[model samples]
Target: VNAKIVFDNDKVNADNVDGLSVSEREVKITKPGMYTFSGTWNDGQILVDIGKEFEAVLVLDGVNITNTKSAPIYIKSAEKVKIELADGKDNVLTDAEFYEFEDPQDNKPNACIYSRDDITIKGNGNLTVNANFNNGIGTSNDLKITGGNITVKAFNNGLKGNGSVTISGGNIDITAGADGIKVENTEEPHKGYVNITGGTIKIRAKDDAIDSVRSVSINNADVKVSVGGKDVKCEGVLNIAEGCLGKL
Candidate 1:
């Protein structure tokens, strides 16, 4: 595998990272390990297409990314995509005001930061996402947020998944036109669940703050939510402790 790839506005230089087929707008990461990125990607994508047995990490150390075609960070396939934000830099990802897929065969994701597999977002830095077309961060499987300061303003759901979304710690704020946080797995009856143990979560939404099909458990979390519609909507169950229900 290649060691590293450096891609910026001026040039692209790398040993192993640049050998892969130069796609149109996506920086496809086929291998594993840590990748540190620092640049302004005007109209591009970062695709993590790896096997199931592998793991990958992307370190963002000051990046201003805007994608008019598709999601800025799109995981086509991966076992786990770890987004580690550096403590010394700021990161921003913005989608187009109106999205139109160039290739319909790709079946492009419908969010600004969309992942087809699992993902873990952690670090000490900050992340801001402006989802103009759809959701902010939408994962098809599981999601975990350990650290970092995340602010998401979305025209749809802010943070959404089809399986589970667990937050242990972080300062997260969300403003969504639809649901703020959602987890619903149709294939598995026992999959649609959300667990927020510790974190400062503030949500302002037009529909529901938290929505799930199975259940939502906030054992020990500090949540504050304002919804013009509903706070929490669940089909399975709802369990709350430590004012977790307060956020809903």
Candidate 2:
């Protein structure tokens, strides 16, 4: 296996940095080590392919990313992958914001950040995902949020993934146009389980706060979900192992 790093900037430099105007270039990781990339106004897509039994670290520095047609970031086939946003002088966006459309195909500007199998997002910085139409983070395998502040304002679902989703610790605010958190099976029965162990989860949606086609479990955490209108359907088993709730 081999390691590589790709850097891009909008303008030329004697600092050996690549320009950001080439947005069509894809960041593919065939080996290990840290694969870093950053850009300016140039909007593009990033593809991270983690081969079997390989681990990789991805860092997205200051970049103005706009994916009106497709997902800004796509990941596939990896044993484990960790993604972190760079801070400090690396402040990427001046007034960085993501937008979504009303059309079905273009409805959600940023569909899924990482859509793959077996992945964990250790959110350690201020990472914001604007999921306009559908889910913010959708995966076919497992997803664990250990830290960071994630704000997902989805015109549809907030987080939907096949497999288990564990929230150990973090601040998750979801203004779901639909469901807050959804877990289901990708194959066969097309139903799965959702487990929320720990975190600060706030959901304001029109449907179920947390809906699972199979089962739902909350061990220890603070969760506040407000479903608009009457007749909110909550399917599967709802278990609150331990927690406290207050009226606002």
Candidate 3:
């Protein structure tokens, strides 16, 4: 919340009205609305400008810098977004426990904390999004995880959204290099929708840990999907009327 101008280095002036500068490792936002950046840098690239609406807040004042290649934060498209991380008087660590990037091929560099469109994340800290560059949180449209304590280890898809993803609560721990929580419709008549009504989802996957090409409805919450991929494809209609499913 304290970024109205604080660029010690990192050439910013897309319309400079508030906060900028993390000592130039990468922070290039070319215009829109609401821009904020606070201290500690080595790599946190945010280049957004497509319809306008941004919010990047990474203030881990316990400061442990080293992004090696990329994504301490990187967002694209920009629309009603919120990227988090705070501690150093900014207060918003909730229970802080995000540490998982000891090079599992570096995850592939995507959402160390990213957003696409219509993104919402509340606090409770504990986030280990090791996507490297594929997806820990990549969206095409809607993604809503109401609270925090998220753990996504995706090299291809951990939390994907093309047009639907609504987890009303929090605490999602997934492991996938292909599919953990995917709602499709990348194009064509493929359609899309994945609704895990409440929260607390755990998925360990090689594929289809939770894949929906068209529709997946789970009411009431608490899902544990462990699939190592054997063509578990559901194009539509897989409604589990209530919650609590263990070891399947």
Which candidate gets the maximum lDDT versus the true structure?
A: 1
Q: How accurate is candidate 3 locally (lDDT)?
A: 0.58
User: When superposed on Cα atoms, how far off is each prediction in RMSD?
Assistant: 2.2, 5.5, 15.1
Candidate 2 structure quality by residue, lDDT tens digits, 80-145? 777665553131222113443336564322454655766666645656676553577777776778
Residue 16's lDDT in candidate 3: 39
| Candidate 3 global TM-score | 0.34
After superposition, the stretches of candidate 1 with alpha carbons farther than 4 Å from their true spots are: 1-7, 13-15, 18-24, 105-107
Per-residue CA lDDT of candidate 3, range 1-248, in tens? 24343433333333333333333545544444444444334444544434544444333322222344555555555666654433222311111123345475643224554555566665555555656556677666677787667777766778877777778887788888788877777564535777777778888888777777777777777877777783235666777674454554
lDDT of 1: 0.83
lDDT of residue 123 for candidate 2: 46
* Cα error, candidate 1, residue 142 (Å): 0.4
lDDT of model 1 at position 15 = 56
* TM-score between model 1 and native: 0.91
